[PDB]
């Protein structure tokens, strides 16, 4: 399969999960400014919504939307935690966490919008603070990772988003459970392998 | 199961799907202003994120996030279209459409925010127009419903969101495929049954 990604963007989540699954994959860096693939072609032909990630499962079949991509990879892996039975409460918890990741992502996205005024920026920060508080409350110290004993796709996606906060030098020390989850994810060897593949430290 | 809903809100989507599935369900109207259940209790104890829908599967187990709720209902129904195999391309298409519904929903949500300035409102309208254009392009006249020959959860969710546009008297006549999908959904008897259950016409 082929993952369309931009360095450090939300596409790092499925990059991490592809690496953890150990399935063969190819990567394609997208220029999101010009909306072009690396050969100079039109990225809108790949994803008409214009976003990364997109996953080409095989020629002519491209899946968009992180929740879909993350679960497709999981269902085609051998990692049981990545692929709970549909209809099981575990599957619902997986989807619920991925849905919340989209909400968390949406709060952060406001921060990188162009011509962002200081006043508009304050509202973005307030929503980031609100979503981070909700993630923090949702995490339980009875669980090594978000959903329980096992690392799953949500963990990777939350860790990437929190990393955007780190990169922006936001103070996230009031969210120790969130920081601990990210620290745990960042130490996983297949996570480091994905970060390397994007030229990131 | 028990669905926590507000009249005409995004919770109408799983209300529709519960009705279509024919499984037994109870409804609970939430006051989102006071964040209270109808007995006067704290809705944050039900969903700490404060949103509808929430689905109590059984006492002590509440699922939040529309994508999770919609797929839980589908996986516990007898309707094959609602429950494609995990890992099948059909399941990925289902999740992709639900993920896009969240994006469409997010564009519309801006319109109902309090103290919305005329200028901020224009940007909201521009994003609604952009997301509606993307939905329109994603729909294919080869398909009776969004994903193909079969009505699915996405169809209900898109139809509810478009309905918010109708209620706001936005001109959506440049999106005929979207309008046709909604018209088709609104004529389904179990859809009308759900609308009735919320006191809606
Ligand atoms: N500054 C970017 C952060 C990644 C990023 O901002 N990308 C997207 C998410 S993939 C975003 O946060 N906002 C716009 C968007 O989500 O498309 C980087 O270091 O790569
Ligand atoms: N005016 C509301 C529209 C529904 C609504 O606006 N609810 C939510 C979605 S459920 C929304 O569009 N914005 C805030 C939110 O999504 O919570 C109604 O007629 O019920």
Curated annotation (Swiss-Prot), chains A, B:
This is Glutathione S-transferase. Residues 1-81 form the GST N-terminal domain. It holds the Pfam family GST_N. It comes from the Bacteria. One of its GO terms (molecular function) is glutathione transferase activity. It comes from Brucella anthropi (Ochrobactrum anthropi). Residues 87-201 form the GST C-terminal domain. Gene3D superfamilies: 1.20.1050.10, Glutaredoxin (3.40.30.10). Its EC number is 2.5.1.18. It is an enzyme of class 2 (transferase). InterPro entries: Glutathione-S-Trfase_C-like, Glutathione-S-Trfase_C_sf, Glutathione_S-Trfase, Glutathione_S-Trfase_N, GST_C, Thioredoxin-like_sf. Keywords: Cytoplasm, Transferase. It catalyses: RX + glutathione = an S-substituted glutathione + a halide anion + H(+). Glutathione binds at residues 10, 35, 52, 65-66, 102-105. Homodimer. It is found in: Cytoplasm. The lineage of its organism: Bacteria, Pseudomonadati, Pseudomonadota, Alphaproteobacteria, Hyphomicrobiales.
